[PDB]
Amino acid sequence: FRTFPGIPKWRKTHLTYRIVNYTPDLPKDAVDSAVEKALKVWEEVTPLTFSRLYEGEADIMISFAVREHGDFYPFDGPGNVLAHAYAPGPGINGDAHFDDDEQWTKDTTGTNLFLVAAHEIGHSLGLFHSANTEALMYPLYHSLTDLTRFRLSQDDINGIQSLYGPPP
Ligand SMILES: CNC(=O)[C@H](Cc1ccccc1)NC(=O)Nc1nnc(S)s1
Ligand SMILES: [Ca+2]
Ligand SMILES: [Ca+2]
Ligand SMILES: [Ca+2]
Ligand SMILES: [Zn+2]
Ligand SMILES: [Zn+2]
Incomplete structure (x- = not known):
C-alpha cells in the first residue's frame, strides 16, 4: 500500500455523499447497488458512515x-484514465469526475463498474497505488473473469487499520 x-x-x-x-x-439500480458496496467499504473498515444526497454540498460528490x-486535467476518451478520481481535502479534493470513459457493465464482458467504483472511491478516501495486483489499488485495470474471487487483500486491511483505527 x-x-x-x-x-x-x-x-x-x-x-455524507451526493450522486452527480x-x-x-447502465440502468439506475446497478450504479446505486455498488455505490452502496464502496460506502459500506468504508463502514466495514472502521465505523465510516454515509448519508445519500441529490442536492447541496458534501465533499464526496461521486x-x-x-x-x-x-x-485542470483533459480526457483521452477510450482506454487508460478512469477519472480524475479526487482525494481528501477542500472542494476539488474529495469527489469524482469520469471521462465519457468505458462501456459500463455489471459483469467483466464490457467494463466492470464494481472494480472501478471501489478503486476510484478508494482514491477519493486516502489510499494511492499499491504494487501487488490482487490488492485492488493497482495502476492498471486487468480482467477478473470470475467476479466471486474479488476480495480485499491483507496489505490494504493492515494499512487502514493503522490509518483510521480498527472496527468496534
Ligand atoms: C487529487 N490527488 C492526487 O494525488 C491525484 C491527482 C491526479 C488525477 C488524475 C490523474 C493524475 C493525477 N489523484 C489521483 O491519482 N487520482 C487518480 N485517478 N485515476 C487514477 S488511475 S489515479
Ligand atoms: Ca478512458
Ligand atoms: Ca473533490
Ligand atoms: Ca461511456
Ligand atoms: Zn473535475
Ligand atoms: Zn488508479
Whole structure:
C-alpha cells in the first residue's frame, strides 16, 4: 500500500455523499447497488458512515465528464484514465469526475463498474497505488473473469487499520 504526499484522510466518522449523474451504458439500480458496496467499504473498515444526497454540498460528490468541463486535467476518451478520481481535502479534493470513459457493465464482458467504483472511491478516501495486483489499488485495470474471487487483500486491511483505527 501507498498514500498521497502528506497523508490526506477524512477527520469525521459518519459520512455524507451526493450522486452527480447516471451513465447511458447502465440502468439506475446497478450504479446505486455498488455505490452502496464502496460506502459500506468504508463502514466495514472502521465505523465510516454515509448519508445519500441529490442536492447541496458534501465533499464526496461521486462524478463525471464527457471529454471536458473546466478545471485542470483533459480526457483521452477510450482506454487508460478512469477519472480524475479526487482525494481528501477542500472542494476539488474529495469527489469524482469520469471521462465519457468505458462501456459500463455489471459483469467483466464490457467494463466492470464494481472494480472501478471501489478503486476510484478508494482514491477519493486516502489510499494511492499499491504494487501487488490482487490488492485492488493497482495502476492498471486487468480482467477478473470470475467476479466471486474479488476480495480485499491483507496489505490494504493492515494499512487502514493503522490509518483510521480498527472496527468496534
Ligand atoms: C487529487 N490527488 C492526487 O494525488 C491525484 C491527482 C491526479 C488525477 C488524475 C490523474 C493524475 C493525477 N489523484 C489521483 O491519482 N487520482 C487518480 N485517478 N485515476 C487514477 S488511475 S489515479
Ligand atoms: Ca478512458
Ligand atoms: Ca473533490
Ligand atoms: Ca461511456
Ligand atoms: Zn473535475
Ligand atoms: Zn488508479
